[PDB]
Design an enzyme around this catalytic site. Structure first.
Site, PDB file in Angstrom:
ATOM      1  N   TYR A 164      40.404  -8.166  45.041  1.00  0.00           N
ATOM      2  CA  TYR A 164      40.364  -9.367  45.870  1.00  0.00           C
ATOM      3  C   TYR A 164      39.641  -9.179  47.201  1.00  0.00           C
ATOM      4  O   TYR A 164      38.876 -10.053  47.624  1.00  0.00           O
ATOM      5  CB  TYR A 164      41.777  -9.908  46.124  1.00  0.00           C
TER       6      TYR A 164
HETATM    7  C1  LIG Z   1      44.500 -15.482  42.537  1.00  0.00           C
HETATM    8  N1  LIG Z   1      45.553 -16.333  41.959  1.00  0.00           N
HETATM    9  C2  LIG Z   1      45.729 -16.026  40.435  1.00  0.00           C
HETATM   10  C3  LIG Z   1      46.767 -16.899  39.711  1.00  0.00           C
HETATM   11  C4  LIG Z   1      47.698 -16.194  38.716  1.00  0.00           C
HETATM   12  N2  LIG Z   1      46.925 -15.547  37.676  1.00  0.00           N
HETATM   13  C5  LIG Z   1      48.665 -17.221  38.096  1.00  0.00           C
HETATM   14  O1  LIG Z   1      48.197 -18.246  37.547  1.00  0.00           O
HETATM   15  O2  LIG Z   1      49.878 -16.986  38.167  1.00  0.00           O
HETATM   16  C6  LIG Z   1      46.854 -16.089  42.805  1.00  0.00           C
HETATM   17  C7  LIG Z   1      48.014 -15.327  42.210  1.00  0.00           C
HETATM   18  O3  LIG Z   1      47.685 -14.001  41.714  1.00  0.00           O
HETATM   19  C8  LIG Z   1      48.841 -13.175  41.908  1.00  0.00           C
HETATM   20  N3  LIG Z   1      48.440 -11.721  42.001  1.00  0.00           N
HETATM   21  C9  LIG Z   1      47.189 -11.162  42.074  1.00  0.00           C
HETATM   22  N4  LIG Z   1      47.121  -9.866  42.144  1.00  0.00           N
HETATM   23  C10 LIG Z   1      48.475  -9.478  42.114  1.00  0.00           C
HETATM   24  C11 LIG Z   1      49.154  -8.208  42.161  1.00  0.00           C
HETATM   25  N5  LIG Z   1      48.502  -7.041  42.246  1.00  0.00           N
HETATM   26  N6  LIG Z   1      50.537  -8.191  42.115  1.00  0.00           N
HETATM   27  C12 LIG Z   1      51.214  -9.364  42.028  1.00  0.00           C
HETATM   28  N7  LIG Z   1      50.704 -10.617  41.977  1.00  0.00           N
HETATM   29  C13 LIG Z   1      49.302 -10.604  42.029  1.00  0.00           C
HETATM   30  C14 LIG Z   1      49.498 -13.705  43.183  1.00  0.00           C
HETATM   31  O4  LIG Z   1      50.934 -13.503  43.204  1.00  0.00           O
HETATM   32  C15 LIG Z   1      49.166 -15.186  43.193  1.00  0.00           C
HETATM   33  O5  LIG Z   1      50.250 -16.033  42.774  1.00  0.00           O
HETATM   34  N1  LIG Z   2      38.838 -13.554  48.253  1.00  0.00           N
HETATM   35  C1  LIG Z   2      38.206 -12.902  47.069  1.00  0.00           C
HETATM   36  C2  LIG Z   2      39.137 -13.019  45.854  1.00  0.00           C
HETATM   37  C3  LIG Z   2      39.803 -14.375  45.691  1.00  0.00           C
HETATM   38  C4  LIG Z   2      40.338 -14.545  44.286  1.00  0.00           C
HETATM   39  C5  LIG Z   2      41.132 -15.824  44.137  1.00  0.00           C
HETATM   40  N2  LIG Z   2      41.521 -16.034  42.720  1.00  0.00           N
HETATM   41  C6  LIG Z   2      36.825 -13.491  46.735  1.00  0.00           C
HETATM   42  O1  LIG Z   2      35.854 -13.170  47.461  1.00  0.00           O
HETATM   43  O2  LIG Z   2      36.720 -14.262  45.750  1.00  0.00           O
END
Ligand SMILES: CN(CC[C@H](N)C(=O)O)C[C@H]1O[C@@H](n2cnc3c(N)ncnc32)[C@H](O)[C@@H]1O
Ligand SMILES: N[C@@H](CCCC[NH3+])C(=O)O
EC number: 2.1.1.127
Length: 424
Positions: free
Chosen positions: A225
């Site tokens: 990220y």
């Molecule tokens: C970027 N988003 C992805 C959505 C996720 N795949 C979903 O639909 O539940 C945000 C979510 O990714 C989760 N997430 C990403 N990386 C991690 C991690 N290493 N440990 C726990 N939660 C993570 C966050 O808790 C957040 O709710």
């Molecule tokens: N902030 C990072 C990761 C965000 C991911 C959100 N699902 C980017 O440059 O995209």
């Protein structure tokens, strides 16, 4: 799997997005939802591509009914509204997409009052309270000038929870690699400390997402990220932190006070060198002090005796001197101010590091874990910082201050110059 998810998947199929060239299925993982490889994927492989027809960025709001009312709104405040709106319209393009979105994340912006007390004395608490308030004010003004005035496009009432939900969604999902886009498909991908590249999103318009690692069939596809955010930042932006101690930062803030009798001259010196009246310095664990932190501390502590350094004479060197050190009294003054700040702060927490570490040895809940990890870290950086200046206070005499550096080129032991001078 899930009614909402299955519906969301079939939706993207008809859209042509997910077809046969799509090597991944949505699955339920420890971290919520995620992309699991349907077959051995290799490095830089494209996992999926989404049609810009499906984004949700400033542009998207512009070409919609509310395109004009937000015409002068900041990019984000505009998507916040766009999101709330489409989430209500039972005919929106993201109808199935919103049935996938978490009603809440672990970001501190959702923590309850008791939860927040687990961050008592922390900088993260300060930062979250600040952020929370600002977005509240900004969004209350949005209701007054756009949500209420335009009762035709914004029928339903709009509560704070709706606001923070959209802000949260926006701050934990959008990709800023272009700088504020939401892509319903690759929106699922999760973060892993495994990945160490942090750049895998382009387009030929659409959204090409390429797995940075080589996942075997059956396993999850992750990405990094943000290699540079601190835990405090990860904890707020998304609902998680890493165990990696090098993610622990604490930011110090220095400023030239207007109550300083030399404010004017000091402010001049600061600014002529890239610093403002107020400057923040980010201090990470096991890392060396930010360049500029010391010279700025010396500039702050300058005071009467060494004030002569603020004359037009040194304006072309003053900073260099500030970097080499001013005087033993200056150096000793700043060291106390800094160490006292750290001790004082370390006092603001309700638990010791030994306690937090015993806590991490058990099972903690999402938010408690984050709190404990965050505070243990802050205490570490604060303790480290205090340690660094403690040494300095011991070596307070090993430095060669201004004066000494001055009399370094005295050359007492030269020649009997008088012989020559007396020869003409
Ligand atoms: C970027 N988003 C992805 C959505 C996720 N795949 C979903 O639909 O539940 C945000 C979510 O990714 C989760 N997430 C990403 N990386 C991690 C991690 N290493 N440990 C726990 N939660 C993570 C966050 O808790 C957040 O709710
Ligand atoms: N902030 C990072 C990761 C965000 C991911 C959100 N699902 C980017 O440059 O995209």
């Amino acid at each position: 799997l899930s009614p909402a998810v299955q519906t969301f998947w079939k939706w993207l199929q008809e859209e042509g997005v997910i077809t046969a060239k799509t090597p991944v299925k949505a699955s339920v993982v420890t971290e919520g939802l995620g992309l699991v490889a349907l077959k051995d994927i290799s490095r830089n492989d494209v996992i999926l591509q989404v049609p810009k027809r499906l984004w949700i960025n400033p542009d998207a709001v512009a070409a919609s009914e509310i395109g004009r009312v937000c015409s002068e709104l900041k990019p984000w405040l505009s998507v916040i509204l766009f999101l709330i709106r489409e989430r209500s319209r039972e005919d929106s393009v993201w109808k199935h997409y919103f049935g996938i979105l978490p009603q809440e994340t672990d970001s501190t912006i959702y923590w309850s009052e008791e939860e927040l007390q687990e961050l008592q004395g922390s900088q993260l608490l300060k930062t979250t309270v600040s952020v929370k308030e600002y977005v509240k004010n900004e969004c209350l003004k949005l209701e007054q000038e756009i949500i209420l005035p335009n009762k035709r496009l914004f029928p339903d009432p709009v509560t704070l929870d709706d606001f923070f939900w959209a802000f949260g969604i926006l701050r934990s999902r959008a990709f800023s690699r272009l700088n504020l886009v939401v892509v319903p498909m690759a929106d699922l991908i999760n973060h892993s400390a495994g990945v160490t590249t942090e750049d895998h999103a382009y387009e030929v318009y659409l959204f090409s997402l390429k797995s940075p690692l080589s996942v075997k069939a059956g396993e999850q596809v992750y990405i990094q990220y943000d290699l540079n955010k601190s835990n405090a930042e990860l904890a707020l932006d998304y609902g998680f932190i890493e165990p990696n101690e090098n993610r622990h930062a604490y930011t110090l803030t220095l400023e030239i006070s207007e109550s300083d009798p030399f404010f004017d001259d000091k402010l001049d010196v600061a600014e002529s060198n890239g610093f403002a009246q107020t400057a923040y310095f980010d201090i990470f664990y096991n890392r060396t002090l930010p360049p500029g932190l010391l010279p700025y501390l010396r500039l702050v502590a300058l005071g009467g005796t060494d004030a002569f350094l603020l004359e037009s004479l040194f304006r072309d060197t003053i900073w260099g001197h500030l970097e080499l050190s001013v005087s033993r009294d200056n150096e000793e003054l700043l060291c106390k101010a800094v160490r006292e700040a750290c001790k004082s702060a370390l006092a603001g927490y309700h638990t010791t590091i030994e306690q937090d570490r015993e806590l991490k040895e058990g099972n903690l809940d999402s938010r408690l874990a984050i709190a404990v990890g965050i505070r243990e870290g802050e205490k570490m950086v604060l303790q480290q910082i205090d340690g660094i200046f403690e040494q300095k206070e011991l070596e307070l005499d090993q430095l060669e201050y201004y004066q000494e550096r001055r009399l370094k080129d005295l050359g007492l032991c030269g020649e009997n110059g008088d012989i020559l001078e007396n020869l003409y």
